[PDB]
Design a protein around this ligand. Structure first.
Ligand code: GNP
Ligand code: MG
Length: 149
């Protein structure tokens, strides 16, 4: 089948791993493989969980930040650029993700993340690696985004 290399990046402690492990081992709390079918087509999801050369390899990127951590939100630009850099491209498959949407201590409005997503041209999705909510839309959207290449 077809193979996809997804790279999850983000401010430390935002839930990069929680998400990854939620998709691979279906539960709430590095290399990961996974056979899955998306929109019919069958494919291999190669997920590389990184820390809060190997990025020139990834095909699609998951820029994550927690909605209860303003700085993690302000740091997206930093990673976005570091990516945009090591891949001489102004548009690289990628999705902005606001994790921990299960909390009430929210310091980042959605209206805030959306504006930033539009200025980028990438999709924005909120996920909770705890209630597993959105954990799939996020990853599958990133794939559909890579199929546009
Ligand atoms: N309530 C809630 N907490 C979450 C969620 N995702 C992560 N956590 C919790 O917050 C902590 C950080 O999650 P973790 O995935 O380890 O963060 P990280 O992005 O991997 N940080 P690191 O840079 O150290 O690798 C853990 O205790 C985890 O259980 C979520 O969706 N909701
Ligand atoms: Mg981690």
């Amino acid at each position: 089948m077809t193979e996809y290399k997804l790279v999850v990046v983000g401010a430390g402690g935002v839930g990069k791993s929680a998400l990854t492990i939620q998709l691979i081992q279906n539960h709430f709390v590095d290399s990961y493989r996974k056979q899955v079918v998306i929109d019919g087509e069958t494919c291999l999801l190669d997920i590389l969980d990184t820390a809060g050369q190997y990025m020139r390899t990834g095909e699609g990127f998951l820029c994550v930040f927690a909605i209860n951590n303003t700085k993690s939100f302000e740091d997206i630009h930093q990673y976005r650029e570091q990516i945009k850099r090591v891949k001489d491209s102004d548009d690289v498959p990628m999705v902005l993700v606001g994790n921990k949407c299960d909390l009430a201590a929210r310091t980042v409005e959605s209206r805030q993340a959306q504006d930033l997503a539009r200025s980028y041209g990438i999709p924005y999705i909120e996920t909770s690696a705890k209630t597993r909510q959105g954990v799939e839309d996020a990853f599958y959207t990133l794939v559909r985004e890579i199929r546009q290449h």
